[PDB]
Each structure stands twice: as C-alpha cells, then as structure tokens.
Design an enzyme around this catalytic site. Structure first.
Site, PDB file in Angstrom:
ATOM      1  N   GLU A 137       0.854  -1.175   0.000  1.00 48.12           N
ATOM      2  CA  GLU A 137       0.000   0.000   0.000  1.00 48.12           C
ATOM      3  C   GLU A 137       0.894   1.231   0.000  1.00 48.12           C
ATOM      4  O   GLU A 137       1.866   1.318   0.770  1.00 48.12           O
ATOM      5  CB  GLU A 137      -0.883   0.016   1.247  1.00 48.12           C
ATOM      6  CG  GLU A 137      -1.860   1.177   1.295  1.00 48.12           C
ATOM      7  CD  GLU A 137      -2.738   1.146   2.533  1.00 48.12           C
ATOM      8  OE1 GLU A 137      -2.426   0.367   3.461  1.00 48.12           O
ATOM      9  OE2 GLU A 137      -3.758   1.849   2.533  1.00 48.12           O
ATOM     10  N   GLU A 145      -9.791   9.267   5.412  1.00 48.24           N
ATOM     11  CA  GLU A 145      -9.945   8.295   6.487  1.00 48.24           C
ATOM     12  C   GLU A 145     -10.503   9.024   7.694  1.00 48.24           C
ATOM     13  O   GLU A 145      -9.925  10.007   8.161  1.00 48.24           O
ATOM     14  CB  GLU A 145      -8.616   7.634   6.858  1.00 48.24           C
ATOM     15  CG  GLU A 145      -8.053   6.795   5.730  1.00 48.24           C
ATOM     16  CD  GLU A 145      -6.931   5.894   6.175  1.00 48.24           C
ATOM     17  OE1 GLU A 145      -5.797   6.375   6.344  1.00 48.24           O
ATOM     18  OE2 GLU A 145      -7.186   4.685   6.353  1.00 48.24           O
TER      19      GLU A 145
HETATM   20  O1  LIG Z   1      -8.985  -3.498   6.347  1.00 50.95           O
HETATM   21  C1  LIG Z   1      -9.645  -3.668   5.107  1.00 50.95           C
HETATM   22  C2  LIG Z   1     -10.052  -2.317   4.523  1.00 50.95           C
HETATM   23  O2  LIG Z   1      -8.876  -1.567   4.229  1.00 50.95           O
HETATM   24  C3  LIG Z   1      -9.115  -0.274   3.698  1.00 50.95           C
HETATM   25  O3  LIG Z   1      -7.877   0.371   3.362  1.00 50.95           O
HETATM   26  C4  LIG Z   1      -7.133   0.830   4.464  1.00 50.95           C
HETATM   27  C5  LIG Z   1      -5.873   0.007   4.617  1.00 50.95           C
HETATM   28  O4  LIG Z   1      -6.237  -1.313   4.950  1.00 50.95           O
HETATM   29  C6  LIG Z   1      -5.024   0.591   5.749  1.00 50.95           C
HETATM   30  O5  LIG Z   1      -3.711   0.057   5.725  1.00 50.95           O
HETATM   31  C7  LIG Z   1      -5.025   2.135   5.850  1.00 50.95           C
HETATM   32  O6  LIG Z   1      -5.665   2.554   7.086  1.00 50.95           O
HETATM   33  C8  LIG Z   1      -4.748   2.751   8.159  1.00 50.95           C
HETATM   34  C9  LIG Z   1      -4.523   4.246   8.412  1.00 50.95           C
HETATM   35  O7  LIG Z   1      -3.854   4.913   7.340  1.00 50.95           O
HETATM   36  C10 LIG Z   1      -3.721   4.484   9.694  1.00 50.95           C
HETATM   37  O8  LIG Z   1      -3.741   5.850  10.025  1.00 50.95           O
HETATM   38  C11 LIG Z   1      -4.263   3.654  10.857  1.00 50.95           C
HETATM   39  O9  LIG Z   1      -3.307   3.768  11.923  1.00 50.95           O
HETATM   40  C12 LIG Z   1      -3.777   3.384  13.195  1.00 50.95           C
HETATM   41  C13 LIG Z   1      -3.149   2.026  13.515  1.00 50.95           C
HETATM   42  O10 LIG Z   1      -3.880   1.005  12.864  1.00 50.95           O
HETATM   43  C14 LIG Z   1      -3.162   1.763  15.015  1.00 50.95           C
HETATM   44  O11 LIG Z   1      -2.408   0.602  15.291  1.00 50.95           O
HETATM   45  C15 LIG Z   1      -2.579   2.958  15.756  1.00 50.95           C
HETATM   46  O12 LIG Z   1      -2.525   2.693  17.135  1.00 50.95           O
HETATM   47  O13 LIG Z   1      -3.443   4.047  15.501  1.00 50.95           O
HETATM   48  C16 LIG Z   1      -3.329   4.486  14.158  1.00 50.95           C
HETATM   49  C17 LIG Z   1      -4.157   5.760  14.006  1.00 50.95           C
HETATM   50  O14 LIG Z   1      -3.683   6.809  14.849  1.00 50.95           O
HETATM   51  O15 LIG Z   1      -4.394   2.305  10.475  1.00 50.95           O
HETATM   52  C18 LIG Z   1      -5.313   2.101   9.417  1.00 50.95           C
HETATM   53  C19 LIG Z   1      -5.576   0.616   9.226  1.00 50.95           C
HETATM   54  O16 LIG Z   1      -5.954   0.040  10.455  1.00 50.95           O
HETATM   55  O17 LIG Z   1      -5.658   2.801   4.770  1.00 50.95           O
HETATM   56  C20 LIG Z   1      -6.751   2.241   4.051  1.00 50.95           C
HETATM   57  C21 LIG Z   1      -7.973   3.174   4.021  1.00 50.95           C
HETATM   58  O18 LIG Z   1      -8.745   3.130   5.199  1.00 50.95           O
HETATM   59  C22 LIG Z   1      -9.954  -0.330   2.417  1.00 50.95           C
HETATM   60  O19 LIG Z   1     -10.345   0.973   1.963  1.00 50.95           O
HETATM   61  C23 LIG Z   1     -11.196  -1.210   2.551  1.00 50.95           C
HETATM   62  O20 LIG Z   1     -11.668  -1.468   1.244  1.00 50.95           O
HETATM   63  C24 LIG Z   1     -10.907  -2.529   3.280  1.00 50.95           C
HETATM   64  O21 LIG Z   1     -12.097  -3.247   3.624  1.00 50.95           O
END
Ligand SMILES: OC[C@H]1O[C@@H](O[C@H]2[C@H](O)[C@@H](O)[C@H](O[C@H]3[C@H](O)[C@@H](O)[C@H](O[C@H]4[C@H](O)[C@@H](O)[C@H](O)O[C@@H]4CO)O[C@@H]3CO)O[C@@H]2CO)[C@H](O)[C@@H](O)[C@@H]1O
Length: 224
Positions: free
Chosen positions: A120, A205
């Site tokens: 990604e 997001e």
């Molecule tokens: O899961 C299936 C779903 O995915 C969607 O696309 C997601 C990507 O999967 C994902 O990698 C990404 O979202 C990230 C985001 O950018 C981060 O800011 C966030 O970070 C979190 C982290 O997970 C935690 O561990 C931490 O403690 O906090 C931070 C935030 O402060 O993590 C998320 C993923 O969990 O971007 C994509 C868009 O949302 C698809 O769009 C969808 O089709 C799928 O079903």
C-alpha cells in the site's frame, strides 16, 4: 448533489471513475454515520463530498470514502509510465481525527481483491487530531515539489508506505504517483516489476469527531 450514497458501500461509477461510501470500519463506532455525495462530473474530473460524525475507538478508521480511477488488471507498476493526478479539497473543521490521502494498492496476484494488496502506498494531504499512519518514521523524501515524512510498517502481511506532510495540510495538490513508486523501487527495493496495480484512489480516512464535511472541489487522475 447528483447522487447521494448514504448506504453502507453505496456506489457510483461513470466517466472512468468510481465513488464509494466506504464505511469499512463502522462497526467499531459507538455512534454515528456518514454519507458520500457525487456533486459533479465536470471537465474530465469528479466533484464530490462526504459528511460524517463518528464516536468510539479513536485508533480505528471507521471509513475511507473515496473516488477511484478505474483501472484494468494486470498492469505492472514498472510498465506504468505516469500516474498524474490533482485534487482540490477543503474540510469545514480540523478538530477531528481524520486525514485526506491518496491510497494505492498493488499485488503480485493481478486479481487480488480491491480491499488490499501486497503493498500500500499512501500520500497524506492532511493529518488532523493527532492520528498516526501505519508503522514508524523512516526518513524524509523530496518528491512532487515538497518534503515528506515517509512512514513504513505493516498492516497484516501488507507493507504500507505513507508519505506525510511535516506541517499543516495541502488542500491543493498535484503529482505523478509514479515518482513515489520510482523512489520506493530505487531506495526501498519495492518490486515494481512483479507488482500489479489494484486501486488508485483519493479520499478521507475518518476516525472520530464531527459533524464534519470534506469537500473535493475537483479530482482528476490519469495513467499511461
Ligand atoms: O482493512 C480492510 C479495509 O482496508 C481499507 O484500506 C485501508 C488500509 O487497509 C489501511 O492500511 C489504511 O488505514 C490505516 C490508516 O492509514 C492508519 O492511520 C491507521 O493507523 C492506526 C493504527 O492502525 C493503530 O495501530 C494505531 O494505534 O493508531 C493508528 C491511528 O492513529 O491504520 C489504518 C488501518 O488500520 O488505509 C486504508 C484506508 O482506510 C480499504 O479501503 C477497505 O476497502 C478494506 O475493507
């Protein structure tokens, strides 16, 4: 608006683009909802917006409503010369946990579903409310006329490269996403000759806050 996509996974397509009320994480919310609006398809681009409010689970994305450029499967990143795109947007408030970001998935399997991939690539244009991308800070990178903080890590087995603004937001932006892929290919061993393009999107997001409204005044995307 021309179309109101307020259903879970409400969907539109036309003019080589698609729009999705992509509330993929909404079951982690304790309250709220979100709608995505098609405002126009003028001048080879898409004009759209999304309104929302969410509570609960502040580290969980509730949604990523997006506009996507439709693409044909089986195109290796190494065989794509250019991914030129521009976006103009506003948020009506910034006291929210949310971003604005390009999202690109690639996979060695050209038929990988659109929810993910092997890799990604994100390009964040906003970072509100103290949120973090996946992973940890890697290094700074000069691309597209700007300096980026590159973060890298894993979401499951998927390697995530997120390019963030060091300061502020970027409400009017244009770039060639192949510059970002080429940088990853050179300096991060990104296997562009084995990876196929899966999605090519921009959106927001949304974690918590609102009522908030994201307006995409214009989006265009091409690839050759
Ligand atoms: O899961 C299936 C779903 O995915 C969607 O696309 C997601 C990507 O999967 C994902 O990698 C990404 O979202 C990230 C985001 O950018 C981060 O800011 C966030 O970070 C979190 C982290 O997970 C935690 O561990 C931490 O403690 O906090 C931070 C935030 O402060 O993590 C998320 C993923 O969990 O971007 C994509 C868009 O949302 C698809 O769009 C969808 O089709 C799928 O079903």
């Amino acid at each position: 608006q021309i179309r109101s996509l307020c259903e879970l996974y409400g969907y539109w397509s036309g003019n080589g683009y698609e729009l999705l009320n992509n509330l993929w994480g909404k079951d982690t919310a304790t309250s709220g909802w979100q709608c995505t609006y098609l405002d126009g398809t003028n001048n080879g681009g898409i004009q759209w917006s999304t309104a929302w409010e969410w509570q609960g689970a502040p580290d969980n994305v509730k949604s990523y409503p997006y506009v996507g450029k439709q693409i044909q499967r089986g195109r290796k990143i190494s065989d794509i010369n250019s991914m030129r795109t521009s976006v103009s947007w506003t948020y009506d408030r910034t006291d929210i946990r949310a971003n604005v970001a390009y999202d690109v998935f690639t996979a060695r399997d050209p038929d990988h579903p659109n929810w993910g991939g092997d890799y990604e690539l994100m390009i964040w244009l906003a970072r509100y409310g103290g949120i973090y991308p996946i992973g940890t800070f890697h290094s700074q990178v000069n691309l597209a006329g700007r300096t980026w903080d590159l973060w890298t890590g894993y979401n499951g087995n998927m390697r995530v490269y997120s390019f963030l603004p060091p300061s502020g937001d970027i409400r009017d932006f244009s770039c060639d996403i192949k510059d970002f892929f080429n940088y990853l290919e050179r300096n991060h061993g990104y296997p562009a000759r084995e990876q196929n393009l899966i999605v090519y999107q921009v959106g927001t997001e949304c974690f918590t806050g609102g009522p908030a409204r994201f307006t995409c005044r214009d989006f265009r995307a091409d690839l050759w």
